Structures are given as C-alpha cells and as structure tokens.
Design a binder for this molecule. Structure first.
Ligand code: ADP
Length: 683
C-alpha cells in the first residue's frame, strides 16, 4: 500500500522484478483513505505487509503496536542519511524505512530576483525596493506554524527537546529566546508592512505564481503549480536568521511493515535490497517524483536538480517533525501564538508564554470512580431488589426483565453494597484510592477537581463528607493534608491554606461563607475568578469544618440539593530574598442531585438549569478525555458557570476526578443508568 499521489506502477515495476528474482508476486495497491483504513484493518491483524506513508501517522500505528521492529544492520543504516532514521524511531525502536524526505524551501522568482537573500534580516530592505517597483519581496502562508516555525526555530525555538531518540514531552522550546527573536522579527515584517498578517496559502501561491511577489516559502508539492505558471523560478536554502539556518519540520515518506505480516523477512529483503537502491528508487521516481530521498547514493543523483538539492539542504538543517501525540497540542499553541502576535493584539512574549504552557500542558485523563452503596432504609421498606452488581472491574446493571444488561468500566469501582464481600470498599478505601493521589498532585503543584455526581440518596455526602462514625473523603483529605504539611514544613518550604466555599445556583455565583450574585471575571493568564469571594485562612480541619457547616446551612432545599457547591482550598507553597510561590487549587465539588425528576414554580428553573449545567460539565469532561488522548477538540468551559470558573483547575496540567454514586435498587435503575452512563461520558 502506497498513496495514489505517489508513483504506483513504478513501485510495481520493482515488485515485478522481485517476482523475477524470487518467484513471489508483489502487492501494490493505492486504496481509499489508506492511512485512515490501515489502522482500522491492521488492528484486526490484516492490511498490507508493507505500508507507505509519511512518518506523521506512523508514530501512532507504532504506539498501537501495529508496526514491526525492523532490523537493518548499521551497514545498511549508513546507506541513508542518519537524520532520517530519527523519523522512523518510536519508543526507541526502528519501525519503518525512510524513503523520501520533504521540507520547506525558499522559492523565488529568478526574473524579479536573480540573487535571492541568504538572510532574513535582508528582506525588509529587499522589499522596500520591490514595492517602489510595484512588486513585493516575500509572501508565504503566515497562518500556520508549519510554515512560520522555520524562522521561529532559527535562533533556538524547538517543539520538543529530542535527545536519546527520546522527545522530552516536558521540554518545550516555545517560550525561549530563540523563539522570541524569530517571532518578533516575523511580527516586525508585518508591523513594518513587509508582509500582511492576513496572508494565507492561496494568497501567497496566487501572488507568487502571478509574478506579484519575488519570494515564497513552500514545499515540493507546490512546484508543479509553478511549473504550470510558467513563472521563472528557483528553489533554494531558506534564509538564515541571526546567522543560524531556518529549521523547517521534515516530513519523511517512510515504509513500515505490519506487525501482523508473516512476510516480515521477505518484506525486509524487498525494501532493503530492491526498492531502496539507485535502480529501485529511480523506478518509482520516474513514475512519480519522490522529491528528495533518504538513500544517499540516489539523492546524490537527484540533487543534480538544485530544487531537490535544496529540499535536502533545508531538511538537513531542519528538524524531524515529531510523530508524537503532543505535536497537535504544540501546533495549536503556536498557531494561536502567531495569530495574536501578528495581529498586534498581543505581545510576542505573552503570546509565546501562553503557547509554551498550552504546548507543554500534561492533559491528564479524568479519573472516574463509581460507588454502589448498600440498600437504603426506604428501599428495604419498598422491598427493593438488587439490579446493580459487580463482576471484577465491571459494574453491571441487570434490568428486572433480564433482557437488558448494561455494564460499565470505570477507573475504579467502589463496591460498598455489602459490608462483607471480599472487595468491599470502606471509607478509607475510597479515600486512599481516589483522593489521596489528588492530594499528592496538589502537593506537586497541580490544580485538582473532585466532582461528586449522583442522584439524591445515592451517597454523595456519605462519600464526600460522611459521618462521625464513618468519615468520608473531605475530612480524611484534610487531615492527610495537614499531617503532610507538618511533615513537609521546613525552613526550606512553607505552607499556607486559604478556603473559599461557594455555590452555583441557576448559573449565579453565591458565596456560602456569608444571597447576592457574585460576578465572574477573567484574568488572561490566571483564568476565571470570582470577584468578591471570601478566602478564609485555615490551619486545621476543625477550622474548615466550621466553615463547611456555616456554608452548608445556606446551600439548597426541596431535601434535595439544587446548586453545585464548590469547596476550594488554595494552597501556597512558599520556598526561599529569593523565594518562589507554588500554588495549588483544590476544588471539591458536590454536584446537584442528578434526578431528572420532571412532573408537576422556580423549582423547575432549578431542574432545567441543573440538567443544562450537568450536561455541559459532562461535555467538557468528555472533551477533556478526548483531549488527553491527543485529539484537537473544543472545550466548552464558557458554556456553563461551574465549568468556566474551574477552567484552570480542570484542563491544563490539572488533575480531575469524579465519583459517581449509585443505588443498587430496582426503584432507581433509570437514574442509576443515567448516572453510570454519565460517568462513562467521562471515560
Ligand atoms: N457507601 C455507603 N455505605 C453505607 N451506607 C451509606 C453509603 N452511602 C450512603 N449511605 C447511607 O445513606 C444515607 C444517605 O447518604 P447521602 O450520601 O446523603 O446520599 P446523598 O448525599 O446523595 O443524599 C447515609 O447517612 C448512610 O447511612
């Protein structure tokens, strides 16, 4: 499997010669969303033996365990440029053969510009000239980092520090000086009207191919269209910046072998000894040009064409495009950086500082727990029957009709149904398993949320607060916390806790530690905050308990809870003249009874607003989960007050968790299924 845009029958020719030498016939096909279908089909132990695609999507298949560990000897590795092998490396395993190589180059109008500039610094001057003569120095696509990054990386920007065939996921080069200088100089071109911020791909292409501008930046795909344009063009090295080369992301067309294929040995023989040779690549190139190639020997032939030469010069000076899931997060962080600094609505420093922290953001998954409580007094009186069960991980709902069985897996399932059961879940168990780690995250400097989700009676309060005979999460957490402060607090580090306790009622904010509506506002770095919310210093749990008593006295009636209570602990961790502060927000949120209890006043507005608010929470949480698995999505924080307020404590580097409580009873099976399905929403 190779692409349709490539040279298929040329590759078939190399297979048509493989049969001759071996006797084994060749499999060359170019089907469909081949890249999108390959993981669909390779996942079930099918697909082709060999797949040809760019290394972009190869990093994923590898993670999915889909490609085999290739095993060329050094002798063979030495035949291709050493940098190309970094493309086809995942989790420190060689997982494909580099084939072709692709990179942005400087493209210029020989007629307008016989001697193109070596140097970015030249362009303003160059431009001033061409504009006086009714033309322009340079137009390229300023909309997307793929194109802008090269200049940005020149003085030292980088996406993820790559060392031991490892990308330090945590080491990002978007904030740094090298990146500031590139973006700054870029932005200046714009400021000084040497380029337009609105310039995208088509404008740029149109302009260059019509003879309106002297220069553009594009990749070999763009050549053909110039050819048709009859514009007299040259393709060359990108300009230096601060005497350092521009660093475009390199795209390596690479050939991997299916982990499923039994032809692993035969495939290797084919790629190494047939395809990857002067003859073998010429066969393909002749059909449809490979651009620059990884095979040193043949590239040297190809680089006779100085356009190709230059794709190579620039690929080598560039950086292999990371095939990791975090690249997305990077792409979008930097896109937004550049858009806003080019706009002038935001300084370079602030743009890139914002982008660093989005590109470097953990995006940890949301932890979902479930707890099934014992039969309530009321349910026993109702002669209630069990409809909820455990099996191993799985919580299973078996409808009385016995046709309907719904099952669910959460990160953890707390089975507190029968105080007996060899896996019964006590209060301590619930704490140690779900919340303790949050406290460890809080101490590491991460913001955290614990949401408590369920219908009235399902055990939210029991779980969160508890009773003197049986203390729930909040009390244990605080006493864990304070005992750890005691431990940790030293002449090196100091701990300070403040506490706010508010509620979201009908999307309004009410402070429970004093009912007037407080206004939400937003800081552009530190995010949403409540204007006029009390922050009471705390020193022990007893302090908090006072406060949570005062607060809960003023929360919500029916006795159902009809607001979302937000218990918050801001903890400042001051070390020392030279003394930083590390801030963790800890939000413990008792959500409102999920009952969609809709029958026959302002009690209704509540219901409406609770359903709406909880739906939005779920949406964002769901978005979070998807985000955490690396896919670009929109997170509707702003769509609900609770979610907007906790924005900075939800995503980013934050640690979010939810405990859904349910009733084991047949009476409640529908709300139980609402809850459990909700909690799945959250993966
Ligand atoms: N996991 C549990 N194990 C034993 N009893 C529970 C459990 N959860 C709730 N209960 C019992 O049910 C009562 C009501 O619990 P509660 O958490 O207030 O539900 P909600 O907070 O949603 O109203 C508690 O006082 C307790 O006796």
């Amino acid at each position: 499997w190779i692409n349709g845009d490539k040279g298929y029958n040329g590759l078939a020719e190399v297979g048509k010669k493989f049969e001759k030498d071996t006797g084994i016939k060749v499999t060359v096909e170019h089907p469909d969303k081949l890249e999108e279908k390959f993981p669909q089909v390779a996942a079930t132990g099918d697909g082709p033996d060999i797949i040809f695609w760019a290394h972009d999507r190869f990093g994923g298949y590898a993670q999915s365990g889909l490609l085999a560990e290739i095993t060329p000897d050094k002798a063979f590795q030495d035949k291709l440029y050493p940098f190309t092998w970094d493309a086809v490396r995942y989790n420190g395993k060689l997982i494909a053969y580099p084939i072709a190589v692709e990179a942005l180059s400087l493209i210029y109008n020989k007629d307008l510009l016989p001697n193109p500039p070596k140097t970015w610094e030249e362009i303003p001057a160059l431009d001033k000239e061409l504009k006086a003569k009714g033309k322009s120095a340079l137009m390229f696509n300023l909309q997307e980092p793929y194109f802008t990054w090269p200049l940005i990386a020149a003085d030292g920007g980088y996406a993820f520090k790559y060392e031991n065939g490892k990308y330090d996921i945590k080491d990002v080069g978007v904030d740094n000086a090298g990146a500031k200088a590139g973006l700054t100089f870029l932005v200046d071109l714009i400021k000084n009207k040497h380029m337009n911020a609105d310039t995208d791909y088509s404008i740029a292409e149109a302009a260059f191919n019509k003879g309106e501008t002297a220069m553009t930046i594009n990749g070999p795909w763009a050549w053909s269209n110039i050819d048709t344009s009859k514009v007299n063009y040259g393709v060359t090295v990108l300009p230096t910046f601060k005497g350092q080369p521009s660093k475009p992301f390199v795209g390596v067309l690479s050939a991997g072998i299916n982990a499923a294929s039994p032809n692993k040995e035969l495939a290797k023989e084919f790629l190494e000894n047939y395809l990857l040779t002067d003859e073998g690549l010429e066969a393909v190139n002749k059909d449809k040009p490979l651009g620059a190639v990884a095979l040193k020997s043949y590239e040297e032939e190809l680089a006779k064409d100085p356009r190709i030469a230059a794709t190579m010069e620039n690929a080598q000076k560039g950086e292999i495009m990371p095939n990791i899931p975090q690249m997305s997060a990077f792409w979008y962080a930097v896109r937004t950086a550049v858009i806003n600094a080019a706009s002038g609505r935001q300084t370079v420093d602030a743009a890139l500082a914002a982008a660093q922290t989005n590109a470097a953001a953990e995006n940890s998954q949301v932890t979902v727990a479930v707890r099934v409580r014992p039969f309530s007094k009321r349910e026993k009186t109702e002669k209630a029957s069990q409809v909820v069960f455990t099996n191993g991980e799985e919580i299973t709902v078996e409808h009385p009709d016995m046709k309907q069985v719904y099952s669910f897996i959460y990160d953890v399932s707390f089975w507190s149904f029968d105080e007996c059961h060899p896996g019964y879940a006590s209060q301590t168990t619930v704490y140690e398993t779900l919340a303790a780690p949050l406290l460890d995250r809080a101490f590491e400097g991460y913001n955290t949320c614990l949401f408590a989700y369920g219908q009235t009676g399902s055990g939210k309060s029991y779980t969160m607060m508890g009773l003197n005979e049986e203390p729930g999460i909040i009390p244990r957490f605080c006493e864990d916390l304070f005992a750890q402060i005691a431990k940790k607090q030293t002449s090196e580090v100091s701990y300070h806790l403040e506490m706010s306790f508010f509620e979201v009622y009908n999307e309004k904010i009410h402070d429970l530690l004093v009912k007037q509506p407080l206004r939400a506002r937003e800081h552009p770095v530190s995010g949403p905050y409540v204007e006029g919310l009390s922050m009471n210093v705390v020193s022990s749990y007893s302090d908090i308990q006072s406060w949570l008593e005062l607060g809960n006295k003023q929360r919500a009636t029916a006795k159902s809870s009809r607001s979302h209570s937000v218990f918050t602990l801001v903890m400042t961790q001051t070390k020392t003249e030279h003394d930083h502060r590390i801030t963790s927000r800890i939000n413990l949120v008792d959500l409102a009874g999920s009952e969609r209890c809709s029958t026959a006043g302002q009690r209704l507005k509540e219901g409406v607003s609770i359903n709406k608010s909880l739906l939005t929470l779920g949406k964002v949480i769901s978005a979070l989960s998807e985000q955490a698995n690396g896919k670009r999505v929109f997170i509707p924080y702003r769509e609900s007050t609770l979610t907007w307020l906790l924005k900075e404590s939800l995503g980013g580097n934050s640690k979010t968790a939810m405990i859904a409580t349910v009733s084991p009873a047949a009476s409640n099976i529908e709300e139980t299924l609402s809850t459990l399905r909700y909690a799945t929403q959250a993966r």
